Ligand binder design. Structure first.
Ligand code: HEM
Ligand SMILES: Nc1cccc(-c2cccc(-c3c(-c4ccc(O)cc4)n[nH]c3N)c2)c1
Length: 394
């Protein structure tokens, strides 16, 4: 006898398991067991992934409900799960989204300056260089301090919460609450700080004293800061890191983008499509009985939307494992999700990766792994797949 298929399949972010395609073909929605011991429906075809994400009766918010089958333990107060919903209800959606666009004056130039400075330091220190800890993550951290309007020097301390904050754990994590409460107090202080007048926290600080928002809770304002910094930094840092691996593994693509940097946005869009940075499917709780393919999902059941299931589906992306810069449907991937909860930072995430890659290829046209690919150490039981270190030479 064998046990119910367990998720996740592999923490490796440099290859998709052959098992995913077998699953998609044979049973594109099927029962699995999560690390908590809960049962869930794993959805792995583009068609069924999109169906689930575009049907709000598959609820993000209700995944936080007491007694629900869980993908993993909450690392935040249950209300944070519905953060964007709470932002919307508070009338803050337009202002928040405006604050996190890459279109603010000097933002892209800041990204370029920061990336080039990071790379110059690596070149000065000499190979090997760690492109995660000393390039991608610092670039993400610097970007989000700028976007939030908080001091650059506060970034590192907020950043070191993230190795625990975005754990994918069977059980609650005591350190997560310690760091969360600390970071909330930091952000509360930021809102009271007269020096903070720019970025997301600068705008929230003003809206907080605007009579149109007098009954929005201080809790929510601080929570937006911590949530957006954390989610933004972990998502952009992790995506860029694993994108760089995919690029480095493709010298022909590396050279092409180096020679024709105008193709970098199309390249990044394909790197988004084949990205394995999300370690788990996106969780949703059914709030009704809903037919998904051959399965009638019952109210109260957990559904997991496997992004690489959708994004490597050959019925939507022919030759899915290949990076093709001239696809007819290039942005139709699910790297930023789909529907009600589509990533509000998608444009910023794109620009972070584009500018990071553009700068790297200019500074280090000969960039290559400095260790055999199998020697990368893949972080386990985490909401992202990332190598602990990414050693390169050039
Ligand atoms: C390459 C970078 C990024 C990737 C791949 C990414 C991916 C995603 C995905 C897949 C979702 C959907 C989650 C779900 O439906 O369960 C999402 C939502 C979200 N993202 Fe991102 N994201 C990125 C960058 C960012 C940035 C830069 C920010 C903020 C500064 C951000 C903030 C958020 C927030 C607040 C949500 C929740 C949306 C909602 O619930 O309505 N993300 N992201
Ligand atoms: N960019 C991106 C991608 C995926 C999710 C999010 C996002 C956006 C908003 C909330 C959440 C979220 C958390 C969470 C975990 C650790 C934290 O430090 C903050 C939040 N727990 N459960 C959910 N729902 C997640 C953002």
């Amino acid at each position: 006898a064998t046990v119910l298929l367990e998720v996740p399949f592999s923490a490796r972010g440099d290859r998709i398991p052959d098992a995913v395609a077998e699953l998609r073909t044979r049973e594109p929605i099927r029962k699995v067991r999560t690390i908590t011991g809960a049962e869930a429906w794993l959805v792995s075809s583009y068609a069924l992934c999109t169906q689930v994400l575009e049907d709000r009766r598959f609820s993000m918010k209700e995944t936080a409900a007491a007694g629900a089958p869980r993908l993993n333990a909450l690392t935040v107060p249950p209300e944070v799960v519905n953060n964007m919903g709470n932002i919307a209800d508070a009338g803050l959606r337009k202002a928040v989204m405006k604050a996190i666009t890459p279109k603010a004056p000097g933002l892209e130039q800041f990204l370029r300056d920061t990336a080039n400075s990071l790379l110059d330091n690596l070149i000065t220190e000499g190979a090997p260089a760690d492109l995660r800890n000393d390039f991608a993550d610092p670039l993400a951290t610097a970007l989000h301090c700028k976007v939030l309007g908080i001091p650059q020097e506060d970034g590192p301390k907020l950043f070191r919460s993230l190795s625990i904050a975005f754990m994918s754990s069977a059980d609650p994590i005591p350190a997560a609450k310690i760091n969360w409460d600390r970071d909330i107090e930091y952000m509360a202080g930021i809102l009271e700080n007269p020096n903070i007048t720019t970025g997301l926290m600068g705008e929230l600080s003003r809206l907080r004293k605007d009579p149109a928002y007098s009954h929005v809770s201080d809790e929510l304002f601080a929570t937006i800061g911590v949530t957006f910094f954390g989610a933004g930094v972990i998502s952009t840092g992790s995506f860029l890191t694993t994108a760089l691996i995919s690029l480095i593994q493709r010298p022909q693509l590396r050279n092409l983008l180096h020679e024709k940097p105008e193709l970098i946005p199309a390249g990044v869009e394909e790197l988004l499509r084949i990205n394995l940075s999300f370690a788990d499917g996106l969780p949703r709780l059914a709030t009704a009985d809903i037919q998904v393919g051959d399965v009638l999902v019952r109210k109260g059941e957990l559904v997991l939307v496997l992004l690489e299931g959708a994004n490597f589906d050959p019925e939507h992306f022919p030759n899915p494992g290949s990076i093709e810069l001239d696809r007819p449907n290039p942005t139709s991937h699910l790297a930023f999700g789909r529907g009600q909860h589509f990533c509000p930072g998608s444009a910023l995430g794109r620009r972070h990766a584009q500018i990071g890659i553009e700068a790297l290829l200019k500074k280090m046209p000969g960039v290559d792994l400095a260790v055999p690919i199998d020697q990368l150490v893949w972080r386990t039981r985490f909401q992202r797949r990332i190598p602990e270190r990414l050693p390169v030479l050039w």
